[PDB]
Design a binder for this molecule. Structure first.
Ligand SMILES: CCCCCCCCCCCCCCCCCC(=O)OC[C@H](COP(=O)([O-])OCC(O)COP(=O)([O-])OC[C@@H](COC(=O)CCCCCCCCCCCCCCCCC)OC(=O)CCCCCCCCCCCCCCCCC)OC(=O)CCCCCCCCCCCCCCCCC
Ligand SMILES: CCCCCCCCCCCCCCCCCC(=O)OC[C@H](COP(=O)([O-])OCC(O)COP(=O)([O-])OC[C@@H](COC(=O)CCCCCCCCCCCCCCCCC)OC(=O)CCCCCCCCCCCCCCCCC)OC(=O)CCCCCCCCCCCCCCCCC
Ligand SMILES: CCCCCCCCCCCCCCCCCC(=O)OC[C@H](COP(=O)([O-])OCC(O)COP(=O)([O-])OC[C@@H](COC(=O)CCCCCCCCCCCCCCCCC)OC(=O)CCCCCCCCCCCCCCCCC)OC(=O)CCCCCCCCCCCCCCCCC
Ligand SMILES: CCCCCCCCCCCCCCCCCC(=O)OC[C@H](COP(=O)([O-])OCC(O)COP(=O)([O-])OC[C@@H](COC(=O)CCCCCCCCCCCCCCCCC)OC(=O)CCCCCCCCCCCCCCCCC)OC(=O)CCCCCCCCCCCCCCCCC
Ligand SMILES: CCCCCCCCCCCCCCCCCC(=O)OC[C@H](COP(=O)([O-])OCC(O)COP(=O)([O-])OC[C@@H](COC(=O)CCCCCCCCCCCCCCCCC)OC(=O)CCCCCCCCCCCCCCCCC)OC(=O)CCCCCCCCCCCCCCCCC
Ligand code: HEA
Ligand SMILES: CCCCCCCCCCCCCCCCCC(=O)OC[C@H](COP(=O)([O-])OCC[N+](C)(C)C)OC(=O)CCCCCCCCCCCCCCCCC
Ligand SMILES: [Ca+2]
Ligand SMILES: [Cu+2]
Ligand SMILES: [Zn+2]
Lengths: 133, 55, 106, 114, 196, 147, 229, 101, 89, 139, 81
């Protein structure tokens, strides 16, 4: 056997290697325990506890979660838009002209569409553009 | 019997019954539910009329 | 709704054991009344049919390990036989011929 | 509940169709053949793809299949929830075509003023 | 390919590995494949059909009566709640069911039910280097193949949660316990050889 | 090893009563299992106040001071703290989450290096400075080519 | 013109994808999470579940055809691909073929689950086993997988070849037999049992009464000469 | 390993072996035992009684994704084919509800 | 290493209860590979005193092409003879 | 696509260059090793390692030894940090090494690569393991 | 409210915390293999008996004819008899 010879470190804890064989050290710290050999592995427990809980499910990266501001903005917008869609499609179909605005934008190759303008400013500006090929 | 003992999944797919006998009392270690669609939806079984129409 | 009957039976080892007859449903666990009280009413409503995720079981018996039917086995054909008998006409015994010649070879 | 709402919508469309077909002369649409055709198509599509299908494969299937197969939940609870929450947009799109037209304005609106 | 349990096994994965290696009924019932359950005998008072549960009071059971080769089913399926306690019976056919609530322990009572469970399949364990076979010919008969091999020189030993945390945090304690377990394994092998 | 000869004697109807009787076989007692384990199992602490809906009588927390210390290495792990950039951005990370850091049985490593370590510079062992120039050249070349 | 037609086209594709998600989820649920002992025994499961699974398989089979047809319609409307323009190789009848190939299985999918309700309710109130459950299952299956060759009964007069017309008519009339099998099984399920009259039972009777006339009228429509008018 | 002769004789006297070991470890040689690798299994209380691990019981991101899918479908179809955009100012109090939230 | 289930389950000493004393679970002792029956049909019939196992072996699986060709020679010659008879007919 | 392609390219280039060591300096007590390595833009980045953690490990596959760069007199030496799971790459050329600490460094970071890694002959097979005595202190 | 709970934050005692002795292991193996092991379950019916009572007799106080004469008289009313 090829026992570990000596540990030239002042930290007495590391001297545990002197009590074992080189083959044993390779087997239990190098071959299949390479990612675990001579390591604290506290991150393993921390990540396990992080994953096995009911914490916020909005995820961005493996390291960071989604920004709460972005999440709240998205949720508020979704709820309000869904409510608008339902209400307008179930109650406000009597007067389409009053309930909806007509707008569009066409390819720049074709002449600018009549409905291509900034909504809420049609009474203040007229928009036009030069055609491109 | 060889098919059932060696490749239980293929035996179940083909619809073969468990060919081993457990008269000794210990159930076999690879028993499976019977998939009998092939042998039941046939001219010689309950699907006889459906298979006649399909033929 | 928990058990529809109970009995005490002495097994082959000489010990008396209690056997309870569970309430049953026609293939529909949804129609099955899952309760824990001696009450017919369906009081308990469960959002999670399988609280602990444990799967249910439909055991399949091995033909080798089966036993000849003995739970009123003589009643299996009783329904159809009696349905036929209700409309069958039976000749009176007095009018029915009797003491006819024996078969020569039997 | 969504199926009940969609069935009420389909019943309303059927009522529109029946009122139009009550007697000749278009008592209901008053000559809007295009509007009548749109209403008929909306009724058919809503009833087919958004009443019977949600009732059977949406409510009845989701309620019964776990009971009748012995599963804690569907193999895809997320997909089941998604399928439920996706219906309203299609329902509205196929139901409100009768009301909605590209030419929203009525025949007596002076579009030359705008 | 085989997962390093001392580094990654936790909770559900650790329990699955325990079921695979020890085949203890409590874990084996939990991790038994849904597709196939070992066929049993017909329930009787002397030899009731045993239904296993993993520390749960009741289980939804279904009965179809005496099975025959021609039909494979005795009577139409009837579902009931098999509860822990005394034996229970099916009205239609009289089949007798017994609920065995297995406990997370190693005892002769639990070992008595070893023959009543299929061995846990190993081919689906660990990590697979093939996602799925694109073969219509054997989509329901062949598992994914492996480029690598499966080592068979692995010896498992159960550990408490705090002890496992100690093993993870302290490499010296891990080495000490590993050497002790190796010595005990050597002693066990020598004793078995002497007995033989 | 004749199967019929073995079975005809092993399995008999008249022996059914004793063939299926579970018993604890007579084996030599082991102190670690039959003596030590029951003692430690019975000496478990008991708490009057435990989670009634989900807890048990033995759900006794281990004090932080009694939790095992971290002695694997002296170097600190500032990842636990959460860097000022992440704090300012308000990003939530699992590595520096208080609940996940509060481990039950083992203390997480201290963010600062152990006082024993001295960070005074000594003498240079290895030095290949041209690697910096090579890396700059290769990185700039790949960036230019990709652009 | 542009508007409700394009909205309906895109909504049809949208509903096709929604059905894709739905039947994928349900079929995989059945195939992977079914309880032990019911993995393959379709008979034991209640008739409603069997019908639902069969209809889901039919929807999976037919949805891509409808999706492709609707996509081609959208392309013709917007990009003017002339898939259905006879001038330069387009086939207007191809659109009808592709649509009806899914359309008839669609109505079969709608109807098949309805039979399970009666098939379950009648035994429950009659305290008796259903009549010929295996035969009813095989009849619904034969209807399901033979409805894929009768899509042309909606296109008799379009101008298709007499060979295809005759094939469609023959298979359509042949389809009537399994419906008769189911009707006789329903009728026999009501005899020699302990009846427990209930509102579901009355609804089942009304369903049977309506279905008889519905199927009879469909069979009459199968008459080619009458179908012309 | 080496077992003392006196200890082995004592074991033989106190116990007579009449059954063969079922464990396959008896066939292992010293080389195989040395090459064996020890692995640790974490044993704790068991709460999940299924092969599948515990699954989250809520899908908030999924619900909101479906809401966004519905909104996109309706708005895009109306804008492309009807050219109509909902006038959120008509029901100004829902827009103000968003602004307040 | 067992061939028969009854012999396998008769006297088991490597059960979990026994192995828990040493707390060592070798991978080579898996129940999956612990026992495996032979590929030949075996069925039980009632004997004079108890059930007895009878094996039904029909054909071998190790025949070789030389033997097969030797057995097939007569068929080839008969085919040739019948063809010649047809030609001369 | 542009943003993520640029990010992936830069990050993976940094990861590839991370292994190589630009500078290495012991502490005053020779208890810690300060390592300067390449940064994403080619500048210097500082890190700290423990000499005890530092170790030169043999390859997992024993037939791949001949393929190691260390076989060449001007190759590369792969030193693995067993605590941080990191790799330190050093040129074998003596021009890059301090010739009064190199000997101790290589005699201290090469403890796990021993003779038994190549196998045991029949003279040392018995001594490969420590014999276990059972029952000698009591019956 | 009961409050937050996490069962994994508490110690478990499913396994002994002290390793065995070599001599004790050897003696345990010897004793285990010197005596029969506990039996494993078997699912064979040994002299099976009727689940119900004795088969109804051809003649006697109660015969199978009495049972047969009951199918034709079957009623479940709203009032007692
Ligand atoms: C698209 C544009 C459209 C514009 C429209 C017009 C809008 C104009 C008005 C906007 C304000 C409206 C009034 C409302 C204010 C907020 C309160 C409210 O009611 O609304 C809540 C409203 C909605 O509520 P919610 O989102 O649902 O609530 C949940 C939230 O998550 C909240 O969760 P929380 O409570 O946990 O978080 C609180 C946190 C807000 O949450 C956060 O923590 C978010 C992140 C905050 C910091 C963001 C900037 C710094 C990030 C680091 C990197 C910077 C870039 C790199 C450096 C170089 C520059 C390029 O609040 C703060 O701390 C904000 C105080 C101000 C911080 C300023 C710090 C500057 C540091 C600069 C030095 C460091 C950089 C290095 C420089 C170079 C060195 C060489 O939320 C917000 O608006 C969030 C942000 C609000 C704060 C402002 C953030 C940006 C400030 C940048 C200043 C300029 C910096 C650079 C200067 C140049 C030299 C360096
Ligand atoms: C349904 C009634 C309202 C709720 C229930 C009742 C109230 C309960 C709390 C009461 C006591 C505590 C109050 C403090 C606040 C606690 C909750 C909170 O943080 O606030 C929620 C939330 C803020 O929390 P957050 O920070 O977003 O939550 C993020 C967390 O991660 C948490 O995330 P999360 O997962 O929990 O979900 C976040 C989600 C929370 O989830 C939701 O609640 C989703 C939104 C509700 C369901 C929408 C379904 C779609 C159809 C709705 C149709 C409604 C009817 C038609 C309305 C318009 C036409 C009249 O928040 C949002 O996304 C909010 C979106 C903005 C609101 C849009 C809906 C407005 C109308 C609601 C119905 C009003 C009925 C009464 C008036 C009727 C007039 C005829 O929003 C607000 O605080 C908005 C308040 C102002 C709007 C509502 C009141 C005015 C509505 C306009 C019409 C009436 C005008 C006259 C009003 C006169 C004075 C009242
Ligand atoms: C001012 C109105 C003017 C007239 C028009 C009104 C039109 C209304 C809708 C008409 C159609 C459906 C009518 C159903 C009425 C009966 C509901 C029922 O069975 O009682 C609840 C019932 C509770 O009674 P239970 O189950 O017998 O006993 C349990 C105990 O309650 C104890 O249970 P617990 O321990 O869980 O305690 C909580 C309990 C205690 O609360 C109560 O019992 C209070 C009274 C009931 C309030 C119900 C609505 C509350 C507000 C919901 C807002 C959305 C969620 C945001 C968060 C809200 C937070 C408050 O609350 C609930 O259980 C209610 C949950 C509500 C969930 C709603 C979201 C489900 C997804 C949407 C499905 C339906 C979509 C339909 C539209 C489709 C369009 C294509 O639970 C359910 O069955 C849930 C039904 C959920 C769907 C229906 C209700 C939501 C309708 C939203 C508006 C749709 C408008 C569409 C047309 C117009 C568009 C602009
Ligand atoms: C040509 C088109 C080519 C298209 C190529 C497309 C290429 C890309 C493919 C991509 C998709 C691959 C996946 C396909 C999945 C399909 C859906 C499905 O079921 O998945 C289940 C699958 C898993 O769910 P599951 O519920 O577990 O599945 C259970 C099984 O499916 C089991 O289901 P089951 O329980 O319903 O089993 C029913 C089966 C079970 O019953 C049986 O065992 C059959 C009968 C066997 C015995 C017969 C004996 C008869 C008597 C002897 C012979 C007598 C004749 C004389 C000779 C003998 C004389 C002695 O019986 C039948 O219904 C078969 C009919 C039997 C009649 C036999 C007549 C023979 C006469 C010869 C001529 C006619 C032959 C017709 C074909 C016959 C069947 C192969 O679903 C999923 O995984 C999720 C959905 C995935 C969807 C993926 C996308 C699909 C896209 C499809 C596009 C198709 C386009 C073309 C459509 C139109 C074509 C005309
Ligand atoms: C101080 C400021 C606040 C800062 C704090 C934080 C604020 C958070 C805000 C978050 C906002 C989230 C998004 C909201 C969307 C709202 C949409 C909407 O209703 O717009 C129309 C809405 C009303 O217009 P309307 O005429 O009634 O109706 C619209 C027309 O029908 C048709 O109109 P249109 O044709 O012009 O269409 C436009 C319409 C959409 O209309 C449509 O429906 C047309 C859609 C056409 C789509 C065509 C394509 C089809 C779609 C699919 C295409 C792709 C294909 C998909 C499918 C796949 C195919 C392969 O949407 C918009 O108007 C776009 C949004 C406008 C900009 C709002 C952004 C606000 C700031 C966001 C960032 C804040 C954080 C910065 C950093 C802070 C820290 C330093 O106009 C507004 O935007 C008004 C509300 C503005 C609110 C601003 C934020 C709150 C503060 C307000 C001031 C309060 C006092 C503050 C004092 C502070 C003292 C310290
Ligand atoms: C649930 C929906 C559904 C069902 C189940 C069916 C079932 C059948 N359908 Fe129909 N069909 C439609 C929905 C349905 N159909 C729709 C929506 C259209 C038009 C689509 C469109 O263009 O918009 C259509 C169109 C349609 C046509 C084209 C008509 C035309 O365009 O001119 C034909 C032709 O044969 C037909 C035939 C059949 C047949 C043979 C059945 C068979 O399945 C029926 C078999 C059953 C029987 C035959 C019953 C037997 C009867 C008894 C046992 C009772 C006897 C008692 C007495 C006589 C008193 N259908
Ligand atoms: C032009 C473009 C060409 C295509 C380019 C893209 C290539 C894509 C290649 C990858 C995908 C395809 C790979 C091959 C197929 C793989 C299938 C597979 O594994 O699926 C298993 C999946 C999942 O399998 P599983 O998960 O249940 O089991 C896996 C196997 N074990 C458990 C043992 C590991 O199941 C199925 O879908 C198979 C069963 C259904 C098959 C269809 C049966 C018929 C259904 C309809 C009824 C019959 C109607 C009549 C039919 C005849 C009419 C004439
Ligand atoms: Ca009219
Ligand atoms: Cu049709
Ligand atoms: Zn039964």
């Amino acid at each position: 056997m090829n026992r570990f010879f000596k540990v030239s470190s002042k930290y007495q804890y590391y001297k545990y290697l002197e009590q074992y064989d080189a083959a044993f050290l390779r087997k239990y710290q190098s071959e299949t325990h390479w990612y675990l050999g001579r390591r604290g592995a506290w991150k393993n427990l921390v990540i396990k506890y992080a994953g096995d809980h009911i914490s916020l499910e909005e995820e961005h990266n493996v390291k960071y979660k989604t920004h709460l501001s972005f999440v709240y903005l998205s949720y508020r917008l979704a709820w309000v838009l869904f409510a608008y869609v339902l209400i307008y499609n179930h109650f406000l179909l009597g007067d389409i002209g009053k309930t909806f605005n007509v707008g569009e934008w066409d390819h720049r190759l074709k002449p600018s569409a009549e409905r291509d303008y900034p909504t809420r400013y049609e009474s203040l500006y007229i928009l036009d553009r030069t055609q491109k090929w | 019997y060889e098919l059932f003992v060696d490749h239980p999944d293929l035996a179940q797919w083909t619809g073969t019954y468990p060919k081993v006998d457990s008269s000794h009392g210990f159930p076999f270690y690879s028993t499976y539910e019977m998939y009998r669609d092939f042998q039941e939806n046939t001219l010689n079984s309950d699907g006889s009329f459906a298979q006649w129409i399909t033929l | 709704q928990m058990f529809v009957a109970r009995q005490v039976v002495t097994n082959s080892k000489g010990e008396k054991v209690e056997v309870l007859w569970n309430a049953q449903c026609y293939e529909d666990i949804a129609q099955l009344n899952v309760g824990f009280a001696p009450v017919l009413e369906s009081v308990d409503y469960h959002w999670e049919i399988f609280l602990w995720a444990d799967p249910p079981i439909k055991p399949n018996n091995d033909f080798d390990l089966n036993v000849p039917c003995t739970w009123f086995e003589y009643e299996q054909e009783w329904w159809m036989e009696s349905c036929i008998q209700e409309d069958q006409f039976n000749l009176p015994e007095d009018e029915r011929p009797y003491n006819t010649p024996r078969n020569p070879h039997c | 509940y969504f199926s009940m709402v969609t069935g009420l919508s389909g019943a309303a469309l059927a009522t529109m169709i029946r009122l139009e077909l009550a007697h000749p002369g278009s008592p209901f649409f008053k000559g809007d053949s295009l509007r009548y055709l749109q209403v008929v198509t909306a009724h058919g599509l809503i009833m087919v793809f958004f009443v019977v299908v949600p009732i059977l494969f949406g409510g009845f299937a989701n309620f019964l299949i776990p009971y009748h197969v012995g599963s804690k939940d569907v193999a895809y609870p997320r997909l089941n929830s998604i399928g439920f929450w996706i219906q309203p947009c299609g329902y509205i799109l196929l139901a409100k075509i009768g009301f909605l037209r590209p030419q929203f304005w009525r025949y007596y609106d002076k579009t030359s003023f705008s | 390919r085989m997962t390093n349990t001392t580094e990654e096994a936790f909770d559900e994965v650790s329990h699955e590995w325990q079921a695979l290696v020890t085949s203890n009924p409590f874990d084996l019932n939990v991790f038994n494949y849904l597709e196939n359950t070992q066929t049993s005998n017909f329930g009787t008072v002397d030899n009731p059909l045993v239904v296993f549960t993993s520390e749960t009071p009741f289980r939804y059971v279904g009965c179809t009566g005496q099975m025959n080769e021609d039909d494979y089913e005795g009577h139409e399926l009837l579902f009931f709640l098999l509860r822990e306690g005394s034996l229970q019976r099916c009205m239609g056919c009289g089949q007798v069911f017994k609920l065995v609530r297995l406990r997370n322990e190693y005892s002769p009572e639990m070992d008595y039910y070893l023959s009543n469970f299929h061995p846990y399949e190993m081919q689906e364990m660990g990590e697979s280097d093939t996602t799925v076979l694109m073969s219509p010919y054997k989509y329901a008969s062949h598992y994914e193949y492996t480029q690598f091999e499966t080592p068979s020189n692995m010896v498992y030993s159960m550990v408490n949660p705090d002890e496992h945390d100690r093993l993870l945090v302290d490499p010296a304690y891990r080495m000490e316990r590993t050497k002790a377990l190796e010595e005990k394994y050597k002693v066990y092998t020598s004793s078995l050889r002497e007995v033989e | 090893s004749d199967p019929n000869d073995f079975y005809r004697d092993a399995y008999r109807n008249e022996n059914r009563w004793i063939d299926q009787s579970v018993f604890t076989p007579k084996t030599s007692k082991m102190t670690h299992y039959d003596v030590e384990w029951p003692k430690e199992l019975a000496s478990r602490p008991v708490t009057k106040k435990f989670h009634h809906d989900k807890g048990y009588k033995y759900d006794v927390t281990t004090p932080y001071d009694q939790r095992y210390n971290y002695v694997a290495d002296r170097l600190g792990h500032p990842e636990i703290l959460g860097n000022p950039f992440e704090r300012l951005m308000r990003l939530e990370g699992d590595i520096y989450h208080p609940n996940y850091l509060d481990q039950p049985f083992v203390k997480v490593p201290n963010a600062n290096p152990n006082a024993s370590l001295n960070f005074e510079e000594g003498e240079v062992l290895y030095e290949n400075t041209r690697l910096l120039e090579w890396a700059k050249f290769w990185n700039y070349s790949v960036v230019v080519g990709y652009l | 013109a542009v508007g409700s037609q394009d909205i309906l086209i895109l909504s049809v594709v949208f509903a096709g994808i929604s059905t894709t998600i739905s039947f994928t989820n349900l079929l995989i649920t059945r195939r992977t999470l079914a309880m032990p002992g019911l993995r393959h025994r379709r008979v034991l499961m209640p008739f409603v579940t069997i019908s639902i699974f069969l209809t889901l398989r039919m929807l999976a089979t037919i949805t891509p055809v409808l999706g492709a047809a609707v996509i081609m319609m959208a392309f013709d409307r917007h990009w003017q691909t002339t898939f259905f323009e006879y001038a330069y190789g387009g086939d207007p009848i191809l659109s009808q073929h592709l649509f009806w190939f899914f359309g008839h299985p669609e109505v079969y999918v709608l109807i098949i689950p309805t039979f399970g309700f009666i098939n379950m309710i009648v035994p429950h109130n009659n305290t008796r086993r259903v009549a010929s459950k295996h035969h009813m299952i095989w009849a619904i299956y034969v209807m399901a997988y033979m409805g894929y060759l009768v899509w042309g009964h909606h296109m008799y007069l379009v101008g298709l070849d007499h060979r295809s017309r005759t094939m469609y008519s023959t298979i359509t009339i042949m389809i009537s037999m399994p419906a008769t099998i189911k009707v006789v099984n329903w009728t026999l399920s009501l005899v020699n049992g302990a009846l427990k009259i209930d509102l579901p039972f009355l609804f089942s009777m009304s369903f049977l009464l309506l279905f008889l006339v519905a199927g009879f009228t469909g069979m009459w429509l199968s008459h080619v000469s009458l179908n012309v008018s | 390993t080496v077992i003392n002769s006196e200890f082995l004789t004592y074991l033989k006297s106190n116990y007579k072996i009449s059954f063969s070991a079922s464990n396959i470890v008896k066939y292992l040689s010293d080389k195989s035992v040395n090459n064996s690798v020890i692995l640790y299994l974490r044993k704790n209380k068991i709460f999940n009684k299924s092969r599948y691990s515990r699954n989250r019981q809520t899908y908030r991101t999924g619900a909101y994704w479906c809401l966004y899918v519905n909104i996109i479908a309706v708005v895009a179809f109306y804008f492309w084919f009807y050219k109509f955009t909902m006038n959120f100012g008509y029901l100004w109090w829902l827009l103000y509800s968003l602004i307040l939230s | 290493m067992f061939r028969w289930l009854f012999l396998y389950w008769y006297n088991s000493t490597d059960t979990p209860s026994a192995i828990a004393k040493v707390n060592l679970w070798s991978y080579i002792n898996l129940r999956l590979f612990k026992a495996r029956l032979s590929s030949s049909i075996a069925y039980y019939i009632l004997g004079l005193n108890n059930l007895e196992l009878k094996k039904l072996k029909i054909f071998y699986k190790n025949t070789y092409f030389d033997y097969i060709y030797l057995k097939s020679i007569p068929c080839l010659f008969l085919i040739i003879f019948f063809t010649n008879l047809y030609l001369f007919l | 696509v542009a943003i993520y392609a640029t990010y992936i390219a830069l990050s993976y280039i940094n990861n590839i260059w991370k292994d190589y060591v630009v500078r290495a300096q012991f502490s005053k007590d020779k208890e810690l090793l300060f390592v300067t390595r390449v940064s994403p833009f080619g500048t210097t980045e500082e890190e700290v390692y423990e000499v005890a953690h530092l170790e030169h490990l043999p390859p997992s596959v024993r037939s791949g030894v001949k393929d190691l760069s260390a076989q060449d007199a001007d190759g590369l030496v792969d030193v693995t940090c067993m605590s941080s799971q990191r790799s330190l790459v050093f040129y074998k050329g003596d021009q890059y090494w301090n010739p009064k600490v190199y000997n101790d460094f290589i005699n201290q970071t090469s403890n796990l690569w021993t003779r038994n890694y190549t196998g045991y002959n029949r003279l040392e097979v018995q001594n490969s393991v420590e014999q276990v005595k059972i029952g000698f202190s009591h019956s | 409210r009961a409050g937050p709970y996490n069962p994994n934050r508490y110690k478990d005692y499913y396994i002994p915390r002290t390793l065995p002795k070599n001599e004790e292991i050897v003696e345990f193996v010897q004793s285990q293999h010197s005596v029969p092991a506990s039996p494993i379950r078997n699912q064979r019916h040994i002299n099976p008996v009727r689940e119900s009572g004795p088969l109804p007799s051809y003649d006697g106080t109660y015969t199978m004819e009495d049972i047969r004469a009951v199918f034709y008289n079957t009623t479940v009313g709203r009032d007692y008899c």
